[PDB]
Each structure stands twice: as structure tokens, then as C-alpha cells.
Ligand binder design. Structure first.
Ligand SMILES: CCCCCCCCO[C@@H]1O[C@H](CO)[C@@H](O)[C@H](O)[C@H]1O
Ligand code: NA
Ligand code: NA
Ligand SMILES: [Zn+2]
Length: 258
């Protein structure tokens, strides 16, 4: 089923083909900081990314992603709110049509310019697809991009976008350290949720970092010159690819260290 962020096939209509869009643990959410609860079971996050091996970058038609080699046991996410060990498979971003919107998660309704999603799958399920079908199968780390200074690490990613302008395009993208896109402080909010794109599976433990990384307004321009369409289709620039906040319903957002 074709979906996107346009007038006819956008977040407002996803429910027609993916009825879990109106499920009980949908993402993203607004994080009401006064309602955040502390939990002494929570641990510091362990993002063990030093041996993560990037492979390629791909315009998938809804955003772009950097693919990691998840056939080896090296780049893993553990601790934080998690039991067991999750392999890094890819990262991607969401952004908006102007600098003051574009994040998926919001903090007391504040939006950032963009949001990075580092996607991981629980090693006990063997692969990404199998893991995606279990409530404890995925873990996504979300990082806010706040407009300010130019980000040199981010620039390596943005430099490659000229190579992947349209849907299905890919380029070799070796040696990129995903940790170079994390803040120094790993304080986080966590809640049980879902993928923010169809198929919207409710299999994600969300880990949203409190501290953003920076991006310049000039860098933000680079995101918005990508195309949703394939070559030879009408041009639909990737001006915005964010889902609005979804009802928290009966969930609680936990915070570490508070
Ligand atoms: C619509 C609900 C399911 C969407 C998630 C896609 C998960 C795909 O799951 C994949 O399936 C393959 C074929 O069965 C298996 O070979 C893989 O091991 C599995 O990773
Ligand atoms: Na692959
Ligand atoms: Na290619
Ligand atoms: Zn995402």
C-alpha cells in the first residue's frame, strides 16, 4: 500500500490501510515533562557503537537511511530500560519544511528541526523482521536536532545526499561512526510505542535522549532537496516526513536519571 506525507496518503489516512495507526501504543508522543516518572530500575544507556560498520545510504522514498551490518554481534544497544541486547540495523531522520518544525516527538509541545532514529532489533529474535513482530522486539533511540552551530559529523551524511536524490537511489557509505551523532549526555525518556511509519508495528521500546545535537540552518536545507518520487515520476520534494504526536493513552513516560 502506497503511503506518504501528502494530502491524500498522509498520516491522517494511514489508518485506512494500517488500522493499528489508531492502536493503544502508537508513536510519536508529546513528552509532558511534569508527568515523567522516575524509576530506580532504569540504568544508564550503553550504546556500544565503536565497531558498528556502515554499508550504504539509501533513499527509501519516505526518508533516507544509513545501513549497518547487523550480521555481526558488535554494534549493540543495551542497559538503559532494556533487558538483553539489541543490534543496530540502520538510522534515518525526520524533518520539516522550516527549521522550527520537524521532530516527531515533542517536549511540552516544543518541536525541534529534525529527529534522528537509530533502529535496533533484539538479538533473541535472530533478525530484524522477526524481531519487529514482538512487543519487545525493537528499540529506537531518538535524538533531537536543534538549530544552531554546524555539525561536522552530520556533514558527512549530508555530503552524500547528492548521490541519492530520488527513491531507490543508493551510495556506498563506509566507516561512519553512529556515535558521532549522539550527545555527550545520555539522559533519556522511555516509553513503549511503535514504528512512526507504516506498518506502525507496536514493537518499539522508545529511548528519546533529552539533550539534542546541533545542526545549522544551512545544513537543514540539504535534507529538503531529497525527493519522495523515483526518477521519471513527478518531483515531490521531501519537505516534511514527520508524523504528529499520537495519544499517550494509558502509558507513562519514564525518565533517567529522573
Ligand atoms: C504486516 C506485518 C508484518 C510486517 C513486517 C515484515 C517482517 C518480515 O519478516 C521477515 O520475513 C521473511 C519472510 O517471511 C523472513 O525470511 C525473515 O526472517 C523475516 O525477517
Ligand atoms: Na543488507
Ligand atoms: Na547505488
Ligand atoms: Zn523514524
Amino acid at each position: 500500500h502506497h503511503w506518504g506525507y501528502g494530502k491524500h496518503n498522509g498520516p491522517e489516512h494511514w489508518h485506512k490501510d494500517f488500522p493499528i495507526a489508531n492502536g493503544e501504543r502508537q508513536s510519536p508522543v508529546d513528552i509532558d515533562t511534569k508527568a515523567v516518572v522516575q524509576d530506580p530500575a532504569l540504568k544508564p544507556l550503553a550504546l556500544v557503537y565503536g565497531e558498528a560498520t556502515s554499508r550504504r545510504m539509501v533513499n527509501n522514498g519516505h526518508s533516507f537511511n544509513v545501513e549497518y551490518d547487523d550480521s555481526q554481534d558488535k554494534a549493540v544497544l543495551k542497559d538503559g530500560p532494556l533487558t538483553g541486547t539489541y543490534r543496530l540495523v540502520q538510522f534515518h531522520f525526520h524533518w520539516g519544511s522550516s527549521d522550527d518544525q520537524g521532530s516527531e516527538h515533542t517536549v511540552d509541545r516544543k518541536k525541534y528541526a529534525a529527529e534522528l532514529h537509530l533502529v535496533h532489533w533484539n538479538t533473541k529474535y535472530g533478525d530484524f523482521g522477526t524481531a519487529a513482530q514482538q512487543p519487545d522486539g525493537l528499540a529506537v533511540v531518538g535524538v533531537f536536532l536543534k538549530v544552531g552551530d554546524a555539525n561536522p559529523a552530520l556533514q558527512k551524511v549530508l555530503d552524500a545526499l547528492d548521490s541519492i536524490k530520488t527513491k531507490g537511489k543508493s551510495t556506498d557509505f563506509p566507516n561512519f561512526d553512529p556515535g558521532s551523532l549522539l550527545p555527550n549526555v545520555l539522559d533519556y525518556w522511555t516509553y513503549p510505542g511503535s514504528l512512526t511509519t507504516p506498518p506502525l508495528l507496536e514493537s518499539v521500546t522508545w529511548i528519546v535522549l533529552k539533550e539534542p545535537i546541533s545542526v545549522s540552518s544551512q545544513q537543514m536545507l540539504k535534507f529538503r532537496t531529497l525527493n519522495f518520487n523515483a526518477e521519471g515520476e513527478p518531483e515531490l520534494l521531501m519537505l516534511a516526513n514527520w508524523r504528529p504526536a499520537q495519544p499517550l493513552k494509558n502509558r507513562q513516560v519514564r525518565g533517567f536519571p529522573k
